[PDB]
Amino acid sequence: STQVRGYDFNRGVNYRALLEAFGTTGFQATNFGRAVQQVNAMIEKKLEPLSQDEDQRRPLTSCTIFLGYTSNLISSGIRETIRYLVQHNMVDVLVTTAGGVEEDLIKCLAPTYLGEFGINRIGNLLVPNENYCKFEDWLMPILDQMVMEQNTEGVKWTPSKMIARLGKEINNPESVYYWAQKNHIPVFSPALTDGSLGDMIFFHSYKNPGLVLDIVEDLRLINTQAIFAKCTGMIILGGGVVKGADYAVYINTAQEFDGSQPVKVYADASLVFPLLVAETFAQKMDAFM
Amino acid sequence: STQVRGYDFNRGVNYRALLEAFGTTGFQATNFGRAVQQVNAMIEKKLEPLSHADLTQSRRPLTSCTIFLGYTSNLISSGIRETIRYLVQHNMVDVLVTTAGGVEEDLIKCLAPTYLGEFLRENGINRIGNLLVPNENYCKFEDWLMPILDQMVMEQNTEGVKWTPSKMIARLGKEINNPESVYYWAQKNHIPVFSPALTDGSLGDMIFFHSYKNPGLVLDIVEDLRLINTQAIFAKCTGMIILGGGVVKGADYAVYINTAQEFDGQPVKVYADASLVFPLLVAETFAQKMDAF
Amino acid sequence: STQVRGYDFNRGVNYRALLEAFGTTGFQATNFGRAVQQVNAMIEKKLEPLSQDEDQRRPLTSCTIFLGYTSNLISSGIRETIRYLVQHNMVDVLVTTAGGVEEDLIKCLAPTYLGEFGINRIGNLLVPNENYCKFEDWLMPILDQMVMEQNTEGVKWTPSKMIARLGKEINNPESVYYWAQKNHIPVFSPALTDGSLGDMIFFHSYKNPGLVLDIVEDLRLINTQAIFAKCTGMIILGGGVVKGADYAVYINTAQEFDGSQPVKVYADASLVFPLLVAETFAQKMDAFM
Amino acid sequence: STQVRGYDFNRGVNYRALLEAFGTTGFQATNFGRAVQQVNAMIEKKLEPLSHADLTQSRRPLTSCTIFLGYTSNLISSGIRETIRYLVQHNMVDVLVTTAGGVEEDLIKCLAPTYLGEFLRENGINRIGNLLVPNENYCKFEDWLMPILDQMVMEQNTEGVKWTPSKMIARLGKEINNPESVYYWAQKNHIPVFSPALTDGSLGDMIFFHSYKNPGLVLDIVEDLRLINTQAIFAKCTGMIILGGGVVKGADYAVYINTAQEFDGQPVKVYADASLVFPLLVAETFAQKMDAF
Ligand SMILES: CC(C)C[C@H](CN)N1CCc2c(-c3cccnc3)csc2C1=O
Ligand SMILES: CC(C)C[C@H](CN)N1CCc2c(-c3cccnc3)csc2C1=O
Ligand SMILES: CC(C)C[C@H](CN)N1CCc2c(-c3cccnc3)csc2C1=O
Ligand SMILES: CC(C)C[C@H](CN)N1CCc2c(-c3cccnc3)csc2C1=O
């Protein structure tokens, strides 16, 4: 067995040794260590070529990695972390919750600010209401195009296809969804219209009615990704995002007690996720380039 | 300024008095008291006489307060399913909103029971906290569901039905035809149910597999988006009672009951397991006014 | 096995049936049900006469019940709940944390108020600073008497003996510690001087030095209570209070994940404890009178 | 107003830059950044030159900032024991405060290791979260401890020593005589340790049993009360770093790191497991200034 032992700062500030020593530190530090091993196993599996027997828009690899996250993390600076992974094709499918799309898009038009625990407060973050007004103006012409394409070109819209379209339109390398569509990484979000984006789609529908967003074609798409995977890796940030995974890491502060080798790290992902990425995907950056 | 004071058991045990004294006990007990006041205000507003079905596209008549009841699926797996069913049965709320699993966990309880365990896969058991759902429950549900999905596809392609999650949930409640079901009562009383995440869990798995045996089902969320937002927009007053987190995204009255934290990102929040608190809340509010409904 | 089933309000508001139905409701409601059974088992054991073989200031019963609680609950209205139990000899030993003594005593001099989440805020409670000034005035002459008794009568003070003395002095039936000393229920609290009471003892010690509070005699006293018990019941509210129990109920919101048939109810005790007492000790009130 | 922005890994991996970017990431990452600023301010104040041992009754010289380091015993069972030991070893803090178990869990690690398990009684194992302490560790500690307690009683009754928890902790650290021990370094560097709850756990069990074999030990808390309060009162400036809850009851700088909640009842709180956060905090603060100490 492994002895409990924390990093000894008499050795100086050796950051890599420090991060490795979380594994033997105990409690959630140990879980962070296990999360690093689990994600490195997904990456190692993913970079392993498909054998001649295992062969199949996005090409299949030896490990399909699903990255899920709640909207709050897209409001946070973890948006940059997720965008980096998507940009370099390190994950294959994104899943998110109400708000998780528009909050990325809105940051390309106006910044989010730090406050404290016309303003939309999200934890200690501040989104001025003018951000959402700018977003409305940008969005409306796109929605007119989408309804026209539905009615005159037989386009059958789903949340994922809509998200891809919004990513193409924002046309900005800081956007998670710009990179997702450019790299053919599908984004699933049945709760896409539950928040502000949904409010705008709602008002738009009275000037220009009939937009259909089907979730059943998306249901087929996401499940086929899971079913045809050689191996599956899950990285889920925050709770309430998804409902067998060969590798899995969950990072959230949800409790089990009210009913709400897989690894759970009980921590705010805003602290843990960048450290996790530093020791995993960022070490194998060239292999993905 | 109210003094802190707890119920004195030298009075004996009067449960009404015990529950009222939560108000002056402090911490979440006080929030519970504030939640009772807030829900009672909703009810009183709902009951006071009103002195556009085209705009709402709904058959349910407007009252002076539209109450939205939101809840996570785990609460339906629990006995809070009975609490919710009762409110729905007697038309005490106007709109339901739930999360992935929140529909099928109710319907499956009509076919077979959920059991109490403790805080599995080789025996075929889906654990939800200290609750146990045998996998055979889901198999029974699947068999029940398939022919209904067949009818739904046929009605869509030949009777022009445009399905959405809410219309599906209504159909499933009518089909289950069982007075213990939330969704049976909801459709009977024209209380719509919204759940964009309807297909994220087991029910979705079954719909997915069904779609290869019988392709064609479309579930539109935009028509539901209009229905739920028109309910809010054309309300005279709105009340919100939301159990667990992540259900909904101005409300004149609002009560939230959950144990989610604020730190990783007058409305009343009670920081508590709704399985304890919600039946106490119902007892001191809706259940006191049963006659008026 | 037991089927999950919540209370059905079509039966009307039958409070006792409602409380019983928590047992089959699931999650923490089920734990509340288990807590009720566990505490009723302690009480039943306690009211059972000592057999002729089992015989021993406080007389031993068939079950010694330890009631522990954090200071915050004494600031809350749960102070009334605890006081009721102590008043009628339903528990045998109290254990508490820093502040848990003085907050009871101070309420006999001035009230605590409700605020929101010169004022000492405790959660959503408010203690005006003038409360602590009144307490200081009341306390100083008592501390002079205590030092005199130590030096001229050989009194060897410990936290428990001090707490008993303060309870006798407050001489008020609303006080937990008045009833504890009257009924010979010892109160243990090594952290007695960590807060405001300690601040006053500290300043007092420069006008009138030499007060000794020994924790070792208390160590012996509390452990002997545990060792000589026929049966032991633990009821612990909040975390960090104590460190084999035949019956045990813990009510707190502490998590396991950072390392901080016994039953744990994960809930604010301000909600749960009065309901627990209603269905347990309060049902057997006459047997204790 | 600072814009929300996370570390961009297109820069590659610079750990200093990564940790600085926590400040602008939001939620607890931002609090971490604020914690680094706050601790760095303490250190800078401590290091700036000072231009009453009678009143404190202490041998440790005053600096321009007295830093109190508080921590719960579970952190000593973890590897954070090493982090704390390092700070104590290099005199970077002035006063330690801990909770029941916080002394013996350090001393026992000098006799035998704590192991990693997972989140027992028949094998003889005390589980602390995902940590495992074999019961034999406590037996070894007991045997080591008894003759020291004998000496302590004799010194009390014949050399007039007036024992308190802090003086006991110092004696135990001197006896363990091992540079991996927090308490060894604390006594060597005249950093006092306060723990009124010293006897609530295993160490107390042993003291209790010892007291029948060799009666007479007195542990006074009032003399410790004076010592700790005089440290605070005669500080030029005070800094507080408190890990886990329930340790202490004006501070010029204060950082708290724990996962306790406010709901059942500029200082910086980081809502996080200190096993993750504290080594990162130390890396960006005290460990950057090692030379100055
Ligand atoms: C972990 C994944 C690979 C599998 C599970 C299977 N129950 N699954 C699939 C369906 C689904 C959706 C969904 C539904 C409809 C449209 N778009 C998105 C969102 S989360 C989720 C989900 O968990
Ligand atoms: C609190 C309500 C009255 C208003 C808010 C407005 N942002 N709103 C409406 C849209 C919506 C949905 C939705 C979306 C699409 C289909 N079906 C359901 C689920 S929750 C939610 C939600 O919060
Ligand atoms: C559960 C009880 C019956 C047993 C445990 C045994 N480790 N125990 C006893 C010692 C003790 C104290 C203590 C210490 C010194 C003076 N006064 C109070 C406070 S809590 C506690 C504690 O948990
Ligand atoms: C934050 C400090 C500098 C000040 C506060 C003042 N209320 N204070 C001092 C007394 C004290 C103890 C104490 C008590 C007796 C013996 N030994 C230790 C433990 S924590 C604590 C505590 O918070």
mmCIF file of C-alpha atoms in Angstrom, chain C residues 30-283:
data_model
loop_
_atom_site.group_PDB
_atom_site.id
_atom_site.type_symbol
_atom_site.label_atom_id
_atom_site.label_comp_id
_atom_site.label_asym_id
_atom_site.label_seq_id
_atom_site.Cartn_x
_atom_site.Cartn_y
_atom_site.Cartn_z
ATOM 1 C CA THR C 30 -35.908 7.837 5.778
ATOM 2 C CA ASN C 31 -32.911 8.675 7.960
ATOM 3 C CA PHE C 32 -35.192 10.811 10.149
ATOM 4 C CA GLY C 33 -37.443 7.749 10.522
ATOM 5 C CA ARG C 34 -34.443 5.614 11.506
ATOM 6 C CA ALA C 35 -33.364 8.319 13.995
ATOM 7 C CA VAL C 36 -36.792 8.200 15.667
ATOM 8 C CA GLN C 37 -36.477 4.405 16.077
ATOM 9 C CA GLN C 38 -32.945 4.693 17.438
ATOM 10 C CA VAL C 39 -33.858 7.345 20.046
ATOM 11 C CA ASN C 40 -37.024 5.395 21.067
ATOM 12 C CA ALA C 41 -34.791 2.364 21.569
ATOM 13 C CA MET C 42 -32.517 4.454 23.879
ATOM 14 C CA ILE C 43 -35.507 5.697 25.853
ATOM 15 C CA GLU C 44 -37.087 2.235 26.114
ATOM 16 C CA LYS C 45 -33.761 0.849 27.319
ATOM 17 C CA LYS C 46 -33.425 3.751 29.786
ATOM 18 C CA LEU C 47 -36.885 3.234 31.357
ATOM 19 C CA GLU C 48 -36.154 -0.469 31.790
ATOM 20 C CA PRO C 49 -35.325 -1.159 35.451
ATOM 21 C CA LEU C 50 -31.806 -2.287 36.356
ATOM 22 C CA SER C 51 -31.873 -6.037 37.028
ATOM 23 C CA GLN C 52 -30.645 -7.216 40.439
ATOM 24 C CA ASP C 53 -27.194 -8.069 38.973
ATOM 25 C CA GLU C 54 -26.606 -4.789 37.120
ATOM 26 C CA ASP C 55 -26.599 -2.311 40.043
ATOM 27 C CA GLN C 56 -24.086 0.546 40.600
ATOM 28 C CA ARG C 57 -24.065 11.917 42.454
ATOM 29 C CA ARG C 58 -26.433 11.008 39.570
ATOM 30 C CA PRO C 59 -27.941 7.491 39.793
ATOM 31 C CA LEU C 60 -27.158 5.056 36.979
ATOM 32 C CA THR C 61 -29.977 3.889 34.658
ATOM 33 C CA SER C 62 -30.182 1.104 32.078
ATOM 34 C CA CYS C 63 -29.037 3.604 29.385
ATOM 35 C CA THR C 64 -26.707 6.576 29.768
ATOM 36 C CA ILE C 65 -27.501 9.162 27.116
ATOM 37 C CA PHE C 66 -24.932 11.727 25.977
ATOM 38 C CA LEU C 67 -26.298 14.842 24.339
ATOM 39 C CA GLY C 68 -23.727 16.841 22.376
ATOM 40 C CA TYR C 69 -24.251 20.050 20.455
ATOM 41 C CA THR C 70 -22.333 22.906 18.918
ATOM 42 C CA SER C 71 -22.679 26.460 20.266
ATOM 43 C CA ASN C 72 -24.731 27.631 17.286
ATOM 44 C CA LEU C 73 -27.670 25.454 18.385
ATOM 45 C CA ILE C 74 -27.677 27.168 21.779
ATOM 46 C CA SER C 75 -27.919 30.522 19.952
ATOM 47 C CA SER C 76 -30.867 29.078 17.990
ATOM 48 C CA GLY C 77 -34.254 28.149 19.455
ATOM 49 C CA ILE C 78 -32.988 24.592 19.841
ATOM 50 C CA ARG C 79 -31.770 25.938 23.181
ATOM 51 C CA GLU C 80 -35.402 25.498 24.333
ATOM 52 C CA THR C 81 -35.437 21.914 23.057
ATOM 53 C CA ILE C 82 -32.204 20.991 24.864
ATOM 54 C CA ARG C 83 -33.371 22.754 28.019
ATOM 55 C CA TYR C 84 -36.621 20.750 28.043
ATOM 56 C CA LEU C 85 -34.689 17.444 27.891
ATOM 57 C CA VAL C 86 -32.283 18.520 30.649
ATOM 58 C CA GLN C 87 -35.131 19.892 32.818
ATOM 59 C CA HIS C 88 -36.876 16.515 32.849
ATOM 60 C CA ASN C 89 -33.771 14.337 33.251
ATOM 61 C CA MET C 90 -34.136 12.707 29.874
ATOM 62 C CA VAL C 91 -30.365 12.842 29.214
ATOM 63 C CA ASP C 92 -27.388 12.169 31.511
ATOM 64 C CA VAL C 93 -24.392 14.084 30.146
ATOM 65 C CA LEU C 94 -23.994 17.217 28.032
ATOM 66 C CA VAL C 95 -21.043 18.000 25.810
ATOM 67 C CA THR C 96 -20.597 21.242 23.917
ATOM 68 C CA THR C 97 -18.109 23.479 22.033
ATOM 69 C CA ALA C 98 -16.731 27.016 22.399
ATOM 70 C CA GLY C 99 -19.599 29.454 23.129
ATOM 71 C CA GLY C 100 -22.165 26.758 23.987
ATOM 72 C CA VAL C 101 -22.277 27.760 27.680
ATOM 73 C CA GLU C 102 -22.296 31.557 27.645
ATOM 74 C CA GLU C 103 -24.838 31.803 24.803
ATOM 75 C CA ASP C 104 -27.393 30.062 27.063
ATOM 76 C CA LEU C 105 -26.546 32.238 30.071
ATOM 77 C CA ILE C 106 -26.646 35.469 28.078
ATOM 78 C CA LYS C 107 -30.246 34.736 26.929
ATOM 79 C CA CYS C 108 -31.393 34.969 30.543
ATOM 80 C CA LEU C 109 -30.073 38.567 30.620
ATOM 81 C CA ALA C 110 -31.042 39.785 27.111
ATOM 82 C CA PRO C 111 -32.684 38.246 24.023
ATOM 83 C CA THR C 112 -31.120 37.075 20.739
ATOM 84 C CA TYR C 113 -32.855 38.342 17.575
ATOM 85 C CA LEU C 114 -33.601 37.203 14.009
ATOM 86 C CA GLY C 115 -31.717 39.006 11.214
ATOM 87 C CA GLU C 116 -30.806 37.536 7.778
ATOM 88 C CA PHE C 117 -27.970 35.493 6.200
ATOM 89 C CA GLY C 118 -22.345 46.509 17.615
ATOM 90 C CA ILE C 119 -23.800 43.159 16.498
ATOM 91 C CA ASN C 120 -22.500 39.572 16.543
ATOM 92 C CA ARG C 121 -24.088 37.771 13.563
ATOM 93 C CA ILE C 122 -24.443 33.996 13.871
ATOM 94 C CA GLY C 123 -25.984 32.736 10.630
ATOM 95 C CA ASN C 124 -29.289 34.632 10.495
ATOM 96 C CA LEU C 125 -29.244 35.394 14.259
ATOM 97 C CA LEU C 126 -28.181 38.659 15.922
ATOM 98 C CA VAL C 127 -26.638 39.079 19.368
ATOM 99 C CA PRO C 128 -26.244 42.787 20.293
ATOM 100 C CA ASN C 129 -22.855 43.552 21.898
ATOM 101 C CA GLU C 130 -24.643 44.991 24.951
ATOM 102 C CA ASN C 131 -25.693 41.383 25.744
ATOM 103 C CA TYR C 132 -22.020 40.476 26.303
ATOM 104 C CA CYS C 133 -21.440 43.615 28.423
ATOM 105 C CA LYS C 134 -24.355 42.648 30.692
ATOM 106 C CA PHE C 135 -22.856 39.149 30.897
ATOM 107 C CA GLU C 136 -19.442 40.538 31.918
ATOM 108 C CA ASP C 137 -21.036 42.498 34.800
ATOM 109 C CA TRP C 138 -22.950 39.436 35.998
ATOM 110 C CA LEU C 139 -19.854 37.186 35.683
ATOM 111 C CA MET C 140 -17.061 39.140 37.415
ATOM 112 C CA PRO C 141 -18.317 38.808 41.008
ATOM 113 C CA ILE C 142 -18.853 35.080 40.427
ATOM 114 C CA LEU C 143 -15.258 34.680 39.228
ATOM 115 C CA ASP C 144 -14.027 36.531 42.365
ATOM 116 C CA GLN C 145 -15.953 34.050 44.518
ATOM 117 C CA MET C 146 -14.491 31.127 42.516
ATOM 118 C CA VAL C 147 -10.854 32.205 42.957
ATOM 119 C CA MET C 148 -11.446 32.826 46.674
ATOM 120 C CA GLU C 149 -12.942 29.325 47.072
ATOM 121 C CA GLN C 150 -9.978 27.867 45.194
ATOM 122 C CA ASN C 151 -7.440 29.615 47.434
ATOM 123 C CA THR C 152 -9.224 29.426 50.826
ATOM 124 C CA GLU C 153 -11.385 26.261 50.518
ATOM 125 C CA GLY C 154 -9.259 23.998 48.308
ATOM 126 C CA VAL C 155 -11.839 23.886 45.488
ATOM 127 C CA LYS C 156 -10.247 22.311 42.398
ATOM 128 C CA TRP C 157 -12.050 23.858 39.439
ATOM 129 C CA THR C 158 -12.710 22.158 36.112
ATOM 130 C CA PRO C 159 -14.819 23.308 33.176
ATOM 131 C CA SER C 160 -17.733 21.053 34.321
ATOM 132 C CA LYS C 161 -17.674 22.407 37.875
ATOM 133 C CA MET C 162 -17.493 25.955 36.575
ATOM 134 C CA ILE C 163 -20.456 25.310 34.236
ATOM 135 C CA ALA C 164 -22.473 23.876 37.136
ATOM 136 C CA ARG C 165 -21.660 26.980 39.182
ATOM 137 C CA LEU C 166 -22.741 29.365 36.412
ATOM 138 C CA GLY C 167 -26.001 27.415 36.066
ATOM 139 C CA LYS C 168 -26.677 27.725 39.796
ATOM 140 C CA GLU C 169 -25.921 31.475 39.698
ATOM 141 C CA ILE C 170 -28.137 32.264 36.701
ATOM 142 C CA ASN C 171 -30.982 30.759 38.757
ATOM 143 C CA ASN C 172 -33.436 30.864 35.864
ATOM 144 C CA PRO C 173 -35.699 28.040 34.568
ATOM 145 C CA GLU C 174 -35.123 29.012 30.917
ATOM 146 C CA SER C 175 -31.430 28.097 31.208
ATOM 147 C CA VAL C 176 -30.066 24.749 30.047
ATOM 148 C CA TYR C 177 -27.237 24.967 32.601
ATOM 149 C CA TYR C 178 -29.514 25.873 35.488
ATOM 150 C CA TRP C 179 -31.389 22.617 34.922
ATOM 151 C CA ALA C 180 -28.226 20.598 34.264
ATOM 152 C CA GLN C 181 -26.735 21.483 37.688
ATOM 153 C CA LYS C 182 -30.090 21.155 39.475
ATOM 154 C CA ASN C 183 -30.477 17.625 38.083
ATOM 155 C CA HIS C 184 -26.791 16.687 38.452
ATOM 156 C CA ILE C 185 -26.220 16.407 34.711
ATOM 157 C CA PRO C 186 -22.550 17.171 34.100
ATOM 158 C CA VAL C 187 -21.514 19.440 31.219
ATOM 159 C CA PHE C 188 -18.139 18.944 29.579
ATOM 160 C CA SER C 189 -16.516 21.605 27.434
ATOM 161 C CA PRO C 190 -12.704 21.834 27.269
ATOM 162 C CA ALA C 191 -13.161 24.628 24.727
ATOM 163 C CA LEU C 192 -15.124 26.620 27.385
ATOM 164 C CA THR C 193 -12.697 29.575 27.279
ATOM 165 C CA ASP C 194 -12.117 29.791 23.519
ATOM 166 C CA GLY C 195 -14.738 32.506 23.011
ATOM 167 C CA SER C 196 -16.361 35.398 24.870
ATOM 168 C CA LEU C 197 -16.567 33.735 28.249
ATOM 169 C CA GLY C 198 -12.827 33.055 27.820
ATOM 170 C CA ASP C 199 -12.161 36.699 26.953
ATOM 171 C CA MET C 200 -13.793 37.697 30.268
ATOM 172 C CA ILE C 201 -11.923 35.068 32.288
ATOM 173 C CA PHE C 202 -8.760 36.369 30.604
ATOM 174 C CA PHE C 203 -9.279 40.027 31.602
ATOM 175 C CA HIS C 204 -10.461 38.979 35.067
ATOM 176 C CA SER C 205 -7.225 37.055 35.615
ATOM 177 C CA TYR C 206 -5.163 40.282 35.655
ATOM 178 C CA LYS C 207 -7.246 41.858 38.453
ATOM 179 C CA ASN C 208 -7.449 38.568 40.351
ATOM 180 C CA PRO C 209 -4.936 35.960 39.088
ATOM 181 C CA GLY C 210 -4.539 32.238 39.633
ATOM 182 C CA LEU C 211 -7.793 30.550 38.594
ATOM 183 C CA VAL C 212 -6.983 26.993 37.478
ATOM 184 C CA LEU C 213 -9.322 25.017 35.204
ATOM 185 C CA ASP C 214 -8.137 21.417 35.041
ATOM 186 C CA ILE C 215 -9.313 19.297 32.099
ATOM 187 C CA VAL C 216 -7.804 16.024 33.405
ATOM 188 C CA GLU C 217 -10.329 15.541 36.227
ATOM 189 C CA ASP C 218 -13.038 16.210 33.609
ATOM 190 C CA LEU C 219 -11.349 13.690 31.303
ATOM 191 C CA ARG C 220 -11.741 11.088 34.075
ATOM 192 C CA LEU C 221 -15.348 12.070 34.789
ATOM 193 C CA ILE C 222 -16.648 11.906 31.204
ATOM 194 C CA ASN C 223 -14.855 8.632 30.388
ATOM 195 C CA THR C 224 -16.064 6.967 33.608
ATOM 196 C CA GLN C 225 -19.644 7.858 32.615
ATOM 197 C CA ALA C 226 -19.062 5.998 29.343
ATOM 198 C CA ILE C 227 -17.227 3.057 30.896
ATOM 199 C CA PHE C 228 -19.710 2.342 33.691
ATOM 200 C CA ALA C 229 -22.781 2.669 31.475
ATOM 201 C CA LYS C 230 -24.936 -0.472 31.119
ATOM 202 C CA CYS C 231 -25.849 0.872 27.679
ATOM 203 C CA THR C 232 -24.883 4.086 25.925
ATOM 204 C CA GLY C 233 -26.898 6.359 23.673
ATOM 205 C CA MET C 234 -25.368 9.275 21.735
ATOM 206 C CA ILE C 235 -27.268 12.201 20.293
ATOM 207 C CA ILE C 236 -24.858 14.599 18.653
ATOM 208 C CA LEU C 237 -25.970 17.842 16.963
ATOM 209 C CA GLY C 238 -23.562 19.681 14.606
ATOM 210 C CA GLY C 239 -20.046 18.371 13.955
ATOM 211 C CA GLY C 240 -16.795 18.494 15.935
ATOM 212 C CA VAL C 241 -18.377 17.730 19.328
ATOM 213 C CA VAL C 242 -17.148 14.268 20.404
ATOM 214 C CA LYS C 243 -14.400 11.807 19.375
ATOM 215 C CA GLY C 244 -19.022 1.437 22.040
ATOM 216 C CA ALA C 245 -22.237 3.401 21.519
ATOM 217 C CA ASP C 246 -25.181 0.985 21.554
ATOM 218 C CA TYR C 247 -27.438 3.657 20.035
ATOM 219 C CA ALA C 248 -26.385 6.805 18.159
ATOM 220 C CA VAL C 249 -27.946 9.573 16.098
ATOM 221 C CA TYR C 250 -25.936 12.353 14.446
ATOM 222 C CA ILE C 251 -27.621 15.380 12.901
ATOM 223 C CA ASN C 252 -25.378 17.722 10.932
ATOM 224 C CA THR C 253 -24.538 19.056 7.472
ATOM 225 C CA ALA C 254 -20.823 18.087 7.553
ATOM 226 C CA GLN C 255 -19.406 16.213 4.538
ATOM 227 C CA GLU C 256 -17.138 13.176 4.629
ATOM 228 C CA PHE C 257 -15.113 14.101 1.528
ATOM 229 C CA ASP C 258 -12.475 16.361 3.176
ATOM 230 C CA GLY C 259 -12.209 14.104 6.281
ATOM 231 C CA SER C 260 -14.220 16.253 8.747
ATOM 232 C CA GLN C 261 -26.861 0.635 13.456
ATOM 233 C CA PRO C 262 -25.818 4.318 13.984
ATOM 234 C CA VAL C 263 -27.885 6.896 12.120
ATOM 235 C CA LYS C 264 -26.813 10.115 10.481
ATOM 236 C CA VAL C 265 -29.381 12.675 9.377
ATOM 237 C CA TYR C 266 -27.829 15.156 6.948
ATOM 238 C CA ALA C 267 -29.833 18.245 7.882
ATOM 239 C CA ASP C 268 -29.884 21.467 9.822
ATOM 240 C CA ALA C 269 -30.753 20.310 13.348
ATOM 241 C CA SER C 270 -32.926 23.444 13.800
ATOM 242 C CA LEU C 271 -35.492 21.689 11.546
ATOM 243 C CA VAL C 272 -34.975 18.076 12.552
ATOM 244 C CA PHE C 273 -34.346 18.077 16.292
ATOM 245 C CA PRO C 274 -37.713 19.399 17.464
ATOM 246 C CA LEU C 275 -39.519 16.896 15.217
ATOM 247 C CA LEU C 276 -37.280 14.114 16.582
ATOM 248 C CA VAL C 277 -38.014 15.135 20.183
ATOM 249 C CA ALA C 278 -41.763 15.360 19.502
ATOM 250 C CA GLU C 279 -41.878 11.751 18.341
ATOM 251 C CA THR C 280 -39.538 10.405 21.065
ATOM 252 C CA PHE C 281 -38.815 12.024 24.447
ATOM 253 C CA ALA C 282 -42.049 14.073 24.395
ATOM 254 C CA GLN C 283 -44.132 10.861 24.000
#
